[PDB]
Amino acid sequence: THKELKFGVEGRASLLKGVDILAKAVAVTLGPKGRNVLIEQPYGSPKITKDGVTVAKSISLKDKFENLGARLVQDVANKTNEVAGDGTTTATILTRAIFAEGVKNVAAGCNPMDLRRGVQMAVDSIVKFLREKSRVITTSEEIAQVATISANGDTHVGKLIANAMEKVGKEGVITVKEGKTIEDELEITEGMRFDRGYISPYFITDAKTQKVEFEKPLILLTEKKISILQDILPALETSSTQRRPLLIIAEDIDGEALAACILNKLRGNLQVAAVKAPGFGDNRKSILGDLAILTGGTVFSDELDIKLERATPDLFGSTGSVTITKEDTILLNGEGSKDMINQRCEQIRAAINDSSVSDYEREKLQERLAKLSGGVAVIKVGGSSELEVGEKKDRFVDALNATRAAVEEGTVPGGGVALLKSTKCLDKLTPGNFDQQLGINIIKSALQKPAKIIADNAGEEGAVIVGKILDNHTDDFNYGYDAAKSEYGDLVSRGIVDPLKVVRTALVDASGVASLLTTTECTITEAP
Amino acid sequence: THKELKFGVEGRASLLKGVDILAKAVAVTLGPKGRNVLIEQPYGSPKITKDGVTVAKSISLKDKFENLGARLVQDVANKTNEVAGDGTTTATILTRAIFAEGVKNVAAGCNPMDLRRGVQMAVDSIVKFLREKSRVITTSEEIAQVATISANGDTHVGKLIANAMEKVGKEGVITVKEGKTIEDELEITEGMRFDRGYISPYFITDAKTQKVEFEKPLILLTEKKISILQDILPALETSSTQRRPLLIIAEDIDGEALAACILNKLRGNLQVAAVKAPGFGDNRKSILGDLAILTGGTVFSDELDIKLERATPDLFGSTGSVTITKEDTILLNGEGSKDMINQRCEQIRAAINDSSVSDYEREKLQERLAKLSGGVAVIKVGGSSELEVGEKKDRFVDALNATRAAVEEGTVPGGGVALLKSTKCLDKLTPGNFDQQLGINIIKSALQKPAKIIADNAGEEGAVIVGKILDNHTDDFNYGYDAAKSEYGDLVSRGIVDPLKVVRTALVDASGVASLLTTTECTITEAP
Amino acid sequence: THKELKFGVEGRASLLKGVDILAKAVAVTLGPKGRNVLIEQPYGSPKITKDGVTVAKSISLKDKFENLGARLVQDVANKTNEVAGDGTTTATILTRAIFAEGVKNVAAGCNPMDLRRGVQMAVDSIVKFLREKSRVITTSEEIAQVATISANGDTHVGKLIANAMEKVGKEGVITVKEGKTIEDELEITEGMRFDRGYISPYFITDAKTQKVEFEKPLILLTEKKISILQDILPALETSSTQRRPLLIIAEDIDGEALAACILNKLRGNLQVAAVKAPGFGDNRKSILGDLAILTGGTVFSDELDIKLERATPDLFGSTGSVTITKEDTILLNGEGSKDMINQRCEQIRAAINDSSVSDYEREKLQERLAKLSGGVAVIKVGGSSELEVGEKKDRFVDALNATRAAVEEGTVPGGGVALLKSTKCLDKLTPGNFDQQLGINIIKSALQKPAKIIADNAGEEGAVIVGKILDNHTDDFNYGYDAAKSEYGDLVSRGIVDPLKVVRTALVDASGVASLLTTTECTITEAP
Amino acid sequence: IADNAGEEGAVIVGKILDNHTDDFNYGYDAAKSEYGDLVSRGIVDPLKVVRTALVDASGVASLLTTTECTITEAP
């Protein structure tokens, strides 16, 4: 292969061009008055979108270095959106602002390392201020209000959410499924979640949300590395005879085994899924034992010298449903009897009593006790028509993910005014150098862009609105611009709030990626 | 085929362009404040690297002569990195400096041979000075301190290392493997190492480190040249029945035999590896006998008139694990009984007593006695999560390879100040010719680049820092620039030291390759 | 006006191109076997020349910077040729060699100032060695032999020269004029010379040698600044009536006065010439008084309050002839009576006795006493035909100018071997830096070019001849290559010698101009 | 050979061919950059190789000089 290399100013200029294109495309969709984006499909009607992540995921540049910069920012924005729930547009905008200002300051003849130090210090100060000014929500009424606000004023969704997380706790497992009727149902079942997803993206059966759903499947739990198909053939044949989908929870599924599973799934022979066993060490074996007890099946271990060709449908596990995502998987309504789940709980608490490790072993036993005993809250979405059920299900899922983030860290006024108000604390920092002060000024200037862009999307001039907010009413942290009504006032009173988690994650990730892009001195691509 | 030829100045100019591009790309990553390099993958997120060897391994030029020069320097840098552990960036920088200065001096009308002689004399003087000023470490406390410094201040890693090499000695075998628990384990087992690696790169199962690892495999030891598959079929079938990986230690595996092994390994039929028998002559037979005793199997020899189709799993060797690299392979936890290993040790010492050859036979018997009797220290890396275990394992491996080099020759102040201080001894050489003095001056000027580049990466001006170091404080060999803290002072007191082995190897290899490039008078490539 | 500027390497490259072209054109005419140069006239037959100065004076380049370098070297070569008599080709060759080598060494990364210092030291050492090894000629037989050698073996010319300079001394005035007969005449007359030439080049009447000759002219001596023509009209009219040429020796002839004189001279109205009065201060007045006494006229001074309109032919000076060159003018056969010239000599010696200034006034009075009393030797060239007389006159003039230079400093072996042998003393210098040593090596390499070029013009290989001369016969300063006979041997025995003055002047001027060209950092010309 | 050593081959050859005319074994030691008897220093080559090289080079050069027409294939 042959490569092309760019050094110094020209490479950073190409990266800045790519980030500029990406941020310009994504920024038009920020705010209540965000504009529309037309995305053309190879075959079919054009797509009209107001969603920032959808616009970001569909951008690819012809030039290699600009595409490299855009890809880096896209990866960081996707990661922060996955971690926090939202914040792609804000992270992209902040990345563009910080990167452009740092490029300008470096061209002016400044030291990039001191710029990085000043940016880090300013970001730490902003995060501390925001954490100090956050509003924590604890009781059920505040949770209900937050969920209602996150549901675009829907009282039913807010009431339903505040109850599921009353039943299972703030840290419990709540999931949303389609209902059989018109009214909405909330039921506590037996189930549990792991932080291991599906092995291959091709296993996705619901391409809308990139997840896999199976109703009443057969579960194969094995403490083995599977790569030859001869061991899988009896299990697959037994599954084909029963006409039921199969899920295999193993140490790892690699080699020709995964490929056989994929082609089988892609065709109509049998639909199958594969996940890795949770935990590592003896914890993995203990969790597989607990899960085999819960699912009603038996685990297969070489230490017991039992072979996979000995598999019979009696030892196969069964459950009400399984749902697999990229990160987490959740089993629902296991077929295990209550009494043995209880006794296993008794052994878990006995081991908690006996265990000597104060922190590690005790906390792991406590966590698996909670996983086995807590249960799962399921919200069955009811409606008249199918499309109504689907759209309400999506709305309920979105309103659920936001309440969790707000319950974790709190809420701060929305509209981009939290960062704008936090910019007023940066004039108290004491850098050791002239360039660190330049970096602090870079962060201070960059943290005003989201409000300017939100005002611009409304049709106004963002600079004048920001100046009006930043000039008078200096004793009101909650005072800002309501772009929906084109008014000024207390944004929290109007219900314009956003979680502290998403804004903190967006700020940190944008700052880090912008500093990394500024520090870059050489870029290598492939010759076309 | 049709070729293109370049003679004299133009060919050297193209080679210099290639070396210039390579060195410019690699130099930005040198020092604590090294910059970032963005490397674009054909599919996937861009890679951000601060590692010099990673950047060097991913550079290919479109022009043939520049690519030829870059390839030559890349090969030399890879060889010195493999031999010493590190030093790719320093070797590349020194190569570029010496080659450019030699090209300039040759263009000025000088004799390249006398330049080569002067460069050799200067390099010898520098090496002698550095060896004189090195600090040797012998006792366990200094080994622990060196390992702690090499582990970025990690006291646990330094304590663990200093003990393994206490148990097995400085020259013993120490290896690092994944653990089953949280705490770190050090265990002395039975095992041994040879200087023969795998036959074909395709045998690599761990592409991260380009090595092959097997747990409890079957070992086939034969004193034969194998090229027909009929002899391998019984062994391969017996391995397939037992579902265990196979390692064949033969005189050579060539012809269709290797190809069959490769395709079998690439597919899921069976995973296999092949290595050549260590030693040559009767030493090879004796080592194969010792290894067959250790592994619990039997060696197959035509002198005994036993055929490979007679192979039965009883004569196959078994061991706890095997690890194969490019150069060395190591067998761990052999299944041989202790008593026969002991008796074999007794025959080895008896042969030591009987052998008449004072140097050759006695030293070879002593070396194989040490190999069979010493054992292997294994460091099992414990952790909570899998990723933590992997990253700590990599850190432990890196901290291990550096302590060995320091135990071999010593340590000299880091930051590039060792070579900079050694430049002050070149003003005492007495060349016989004018051009030899020019070569000595070439080396003297070139040996200042690493410190200049380290200071430049910190954001300062390398020339001014080097001048400050080389002007005052002339009675302090350990005085230099701490780029991490942007301070001046004793670098050894701050823990900024590097092994003498790596700097000596980098200097020697860079000098040799630069002299070879300067001497080159014609270059032949292929017409596009 | 608009200018073009070149800085550093490119300007020096253009200057080197110009000097290279000039030196390449001039070098082919050096030595007994010098080649021919064809110079094309706008109208007329082409000119065939073997003369270096003629070739040098006819070179102009189209490119401005190359022409600038060529012009600088041309000016220096013309100046050294005028000062010493010859040495244009050698000076040009040495300039080219030193400049090219200095450019190469500067490109190699050396300090030009230390190069200049080393070149100066080497040149001083060479000059000292050459002065030590020179052969002084004092008696009449050696003068006759030197003049015979300088006359291409002509014994009559050598005998005639050695006698004129016997009569007037080595420092006397000897001039060559056309004769009336066949045999050659030598006559001592009254006359004297000044170091002031004609005001305007247009006054030249003999364009062959760029001089002015008048037979029996009228002399106007005035101690005044003349710029108005009303004062000149009576003198010019009196000259026109007598049909005699006019020479005006004034303090200065500027303004419209010179222009009137020029146009009058260019047309047939009257032929006139103008020179400035010799000396400055009261010395000028005393010399004008002595000259007015000698020429038979009277000086006109404002201190005597006598006006130029009062001029009458009685006060006008008359003499046998006048000859005016660029630098010197000579009056011959003055009309003053002997007795008053004698009394004036008596006042001069009386003033010598009375004067108190030991050095200044005494030496000036002595010099003007010698000028007034010594007389002038005139060599009247006799022949059969006019062309024979002219060519013999030119040969006699050339043989005269060379004997003087040899009588001044001595003679050294010719053929370029003096500098070649002097190169062997440069290996004893002790520079304080290596760059000064590089400059010494530059001079040592450059001082071999004249012998190489002389051998090349003979058809041989100059490098091999120089190596043969510089390898064996190391105890013979006079041993070299006779290119005329293509032999080896003692060059002084064969009559191949050159004056020390010309070689010293050529070396010094070439070294100085080459150092000045090397030091140049910016060049400014006019945009075409 | 002298040029590869960094010297000027013409001058070295002239020095060898000018003086020391009664020594068939006298020449330039390029390894030590010296002059002297090459056989004493062990710098010798077989007569067979030099004779074969001379004869073959002379023959092929004469054949190339005599050649009057050359035919190749059109690309």
The verdict on D8 touching C (C-beta cutoff 8 Å) is yes
How far apart are the C-alpha atoms of A420 and A426, rounded to whole Å? 11
Give the distance from CA B206 to its chain's centroid.
18
CB A497 within 8 Å of CB A413: yes
Q: How many Cβ atoms from other residues are within 10 Å of residue A252's Cβ?
A: 15
In chain A, helix, strand, coil percent, each to 5? 50, 20, 30
Interchain contact, B104 vs C109, CB within 8 Å: yes
Interchain contact, A360 vs B182, CB within 8 Å: yes
- The two three-digit tokens of residue D27, written as one number: 């020449």
First to last CA, chain C: 10
DSSP C159-191: HHHHHHHHHS-TTSEEEEEE-SSSS-EEEEE-E
| Dihedral angle sign, alpha carbons of residues B483, B487, B489, B490 | negative
Give the distance from CA B393 to its chain's centroid.
18
- The two three-digit tokens of residue B233, written as one number: 């079929």
CA dihedral A353, A354, A356, A358 (to 10 degrees): -20
Angle at A470 between CA A464 and CA A474, to 5 degrees: 145
Q: Which amino acid is at A235?
A: A
- The two three-digit tokens of residue C454, written as one number: 């002389």
Short-list B451, B452, B453, CA closest to B24: B453
Short-list B443, B449, B454, B490, CA closest to B105: B443
The backbone torsions φ and ψ at residue A145, rounded to the nearest 5 degrees and listed phi first, read -65, -45
How far apart are the C-alpha atoms of A17 and A68, rounded to whole Å? 10
Interchain contact, C464 vs D19, CB within 8 Å: no
**Beta bridge mates, B249:** B221, B275
Q: How many Cβ atoms from other residues are within 10 Å of residue A19's Cβ?
A: 25
Q: Which amino acid is at A479?
A: Y
Q: Which amino acid is at B243?
A: R
Give the distance from CA B490 to its chain's centroid.
30
* Nearby residues of B93 by Cβ (< 8 Å), 6 or more positions away: B23, B26, B27, B30, B449, B450, B453, B510
CB C287 within 8 Å of CB C298: no
Residue C452 distance to chain D (closest CA, Å)? 13
Q: Which amino acid is at A264?
A: N
* Nearby residues of C341 by Cβ (< 8 Å), 6 or more positions away: C190, C293, C294, C372
Q: Which amino acid is at A315?
A: L
The verdict on A5 touching B (C-beta cutoff 8 Å) is yes
CA dihedral A359, A362, A365, A369 (to 10 degrees): -110
Distances (CA, A) of C217 to C246, C252, C313, C319, C331: 6, 20, 12, 6, 10
The verdict on C472 touching D (C-beta cutoff 8 Å) is yes
How far apart are the C-alpha atoms of B295 and C98, rounded to whole Å? 78
Q: Would you call C525 helix, strand, or coil by DSSP? A: strand
DSSP C135: B
Short-list B308, B312, B316, CA closest to B334: B316
Distances (CA, A) of C350 to B185, C139, C283, C336: 121, 33, 16, 21
CA dihedral C90, C94, C96, C98 (to 10 degrees): 180
First to last CA, chain A: 10
How far apart are the C-alpha atoms of C188 and C293, rounded to whole Å? 19
How far apart are the C-alpha atoms of B443 and B423, rounded to whole Å? 8
The verdict on C105 touching B (C-beta cutoff 8 Å) is yes
**Beta bridge mates, C7:** C522
Q: How many CB pairs below 8 Å do chains A and B form together?
A: 83
Q: Would you call A150 helix, strand, or coil by DSSP? A: helix
How far apart are the C-alpha atoms of C92 and B72, rounded to whole Å? 47
Count Cα neighbours of B418 within 13 Å in the Cβ-side half-sphere.
Answer: 29
CB A138 within 8 Å of CB A408: no
DSSP A198: B
Interface mutation vs chain B, best among A3, A225, A261, most B CBs within 10 Å: A3
- The two three-digit tokens of residue A495, written as one number: 């219900």
The verdict on B113 touching D (C-beta cutoff 8 Å) is yes
The label of the residue with tokens 């790892």 reads: A252
3-state SS, A457-494, equals HCCCCHHHHHHHHHHCCCCCCCEEEECCCCEEEECCCC
CB C369 within 8 Å of CB C349: yes
Helix (H) or strand (E) holding A206: none
Short-list C192, C187, C160, CA closest to C377: C187
* Touching, C vs D (3+ Cβ pairs under 8 A): yes
Short-list A506, A508, A510, A502, CA closest to A73: A510
The label of the residue with tokens 């091709």 reads: A202
DSSP A347-415: HHHHHHHH---TTHHHHHHHHHHHHHHH-EEEEEEP-SSHHHHHHHHHHHHHHHHHHHHHHHT-EEETT
- The two three-digit tokens of residue A490, written as one number: 């207390």
CB A382 within 8 Å of CB A186: no
Count Cα neighbours of B30 within 13 Å in the Cβ-side half-sphere.
Answer: 28
Looking only at Cα atoms, what is the longest distance across chain C?
78
The backbone torsions φ and ψ at residue C162, rounded to the nearest 5 degrees and listed phi first, read -55, -10
CB C292 within 8 Å of CB C264: no
- The two three-digit tokens of residue C340, written as one number: 């008053």
CB D2 within 8 Å of CB D9: yes
CB A31 within 8 Å of CB A80: no
How far apart are the C-alpha atoms of C200 and C197, rounded to whole Å? 9
How far apart are the C-alpha atoms of B98 and B106, rounded to whole Å? 12
Interchain contact, D11 vs C472, CB within 8 Å: no
Q: How many Cβ atoms from other residues are within 10 Å of residue A291's Cβ?
A: 26
Alpha helix (H) residue ranges in B108-225: 112-132, 140-150, 155-167
Count Cα neighbours of B39 within 13 Å in the Cβ-side half-sphere.
Answer: 18
How far apart are the C-alpha atoms of B446 and B414, rounded to whole Å? 17
Angle at C118 between CA C116 and CA C123, to 5 degrees: 95
- Pairing between β-strand D26-29 and β-strand D34-37 as defined by DSSP bridges: antiparallel
DSSP C41: -
The label of the residue with tokens 């009494």 reads: A339
Q: Which residues of A318-329 are buried (b: 16+ CB within 10 A; e: fewer)?
A: bbbbbbbeeeeb
The verdict on C467 touching D (C-beta cutoff 8 Å) is yes
Q: Would you call A38 helix, strand, or coil by DSSP? A: strand
Rg (chain C; Cα; Å) = 26
Short-list B138, B139, B144, B168, CA closest to B156: B144
Burial class of residue A36 in the structure, from the number of CB atoms within 10 Å of its CB (0-12 exposed, 13-18 middle, 19+ buried): exposed
Counting DSSP H helices and E strands in chain D, the numbers are 2, 2
CB B84 within 8 Å of CB B75: no
3-state SS, B358-395, equals CCHHHHHHHHHHHHHHHCEEEEEECCCCHHHHHHHHHH
- Pairing between β-strand A272-276 and β-strand A246-250 as defined by DSSP bridges: parallel
The verdict on B107 touching C (C-beta cutoff 8 Å) is yes
Short-list C120, C64, C27, CA closest to C519: C120
Phi-psi region of D7 (alpha: psi -120 to 50; beta: other; left: phi over 0): beta
How far apart are the C-alpha atoms of C309 and C303, rounded to whole Å? 16
How far apart are the C-alpha atoms of A439 and A519, rounded to whole Å? 13
CB D6 within 8 Å of CB B114: yes
The verdict on B9 touching C (C-beta cutoff 8 Å) is no
Interchain contact, A522 vs B58, CB within 8 Å: no
How far apart are the C-alpha atoms of A116 and A119, rounded to whole Å? 5
Q: Which amino acid is at A321?
A: S
Looking only at Cα atoms, what is the longest distance across chain A?
78
CB B130 within 8 Å of CB B504: yes
Cited resolution, angstroms: 2.8
Query: How was it solved?
Result: cryo-EM
Length of chain B: 528
How far apart are the C-alpha atoms of B292 and B315, rounded to whole Å? 9
Angle at B270 between CA B265 and CA B272, to 5 degrees: 55
Q: Would you call A418 helix, strand, or coil by DSSP? A: helix
How far apart are the C-alpha atoms of B118 and B135, rounded to whole Å? 28
Short-list B19, B81, B40, B319, CA closest to B190: B319
Q: How many Cβ atoms from other residues are within 10 Å of residue A434's Cβ?
A: 11
Give the distance from CA B385 to its chain's centroid.
30
Interface mutation vs chain D, best among C445, C448, C464, most D CBs within 10 Å: C464
List of chain B residues whose C-beta atoms are within 8 Å of the C-beta of residue A519: 35-36
Q: Would you call C95 helix, strand, or coil by DSSP? A: helix
DSSP C483-494: TTTTEEEETTTT
Please give the sequence-ordered ranges of beta strands (E in DSSP) within chain D, or none if there are none. Answer: 26-29, 34-37
The label of the residue with tokens 């000089």 reads: D65
How far apart are the C-alpha atoms of A487 and A494, rounded to whole Å? 11
- The two three-digit tokens of residue A466, written as one number: 């920001």
Rg (chain D; Cα; Å) = 18
DSSP C198: B
The backbone torsions φ and ψ at residue A526, rounded to the nearest 5 degrees and listed phi first, read -100, 140
Give the distance from CA B173 to its chain's centroid.
15
CB C378 within 8 Å of CB C186: yes
How far apart are the C-alpha atoms of C175 and C193, rounded to whole Å? 11
Distances (CA, A) of A511 to A52, A123, A424: 19, 8, 18
Q: Which residues of A387-401 are buried (b: 16+ CB within 10 A; e: fewer)?
A: eebeebbebbebbbe
- The two three-digit tokens of residue C450, written as one number: 């004249």
Burial class of residue A98 in the structure, from the number of CB atoms within 10 Å of its CB (0-12 exposed, 13-18 middle, 19+ buried): buried
Burial class of residue B11 in the structure, from the number of CB atoms within 10 Å of its CB (0-12 exposed, 13-18 middle, 19+ buried): buried
How far apart are the C-alpha atoms of B264 and B247, rounded to whole Å? 13
CB C184 within 8 Å of CB C382: yes
CA dihedral D35, D36, D40, D44 (to 10 degrees): 60
The backbone torsions φ and ψ at residue C493, rounded to the nearest 5 degrees and listed phi first, read -65, -30
Q: Which residues of C337-357 are buried (b: 16+ CB within 10 A; e: fewer)?
A: eeeebeebeeebeeebeeeee
Q: How many Cβ atoms from other residues are within 10 Å of residue C87's Cβ?
A: 27
Angle at B522 between CA B518 and CA B523, to 5 degrees: 100
CB B39 within 8 Å of CB B17: no
The verdict on C461 touching D (C-beta cutoff 8 Å) is yes
DSSP B147-160: HHHHTTS-HHHHHH
- Pairing between β-strand B317-324 and β-strand C246-250 as defined by DSSP bridges: unpaired
List of chain B residues whose C-beta atoms are within 8 Å of the C-beta of residue C112: none
Distances (CA, A) of B217 to B198, B220, B271: 15, 10, 10
The label of the residue with tokens 């006493």 reads: C369
DSSP C522: E
Q: Which amino acid is at B258?
A: L
Q: Would you call C503 helix, strand, or coil by DSSP? A: helix
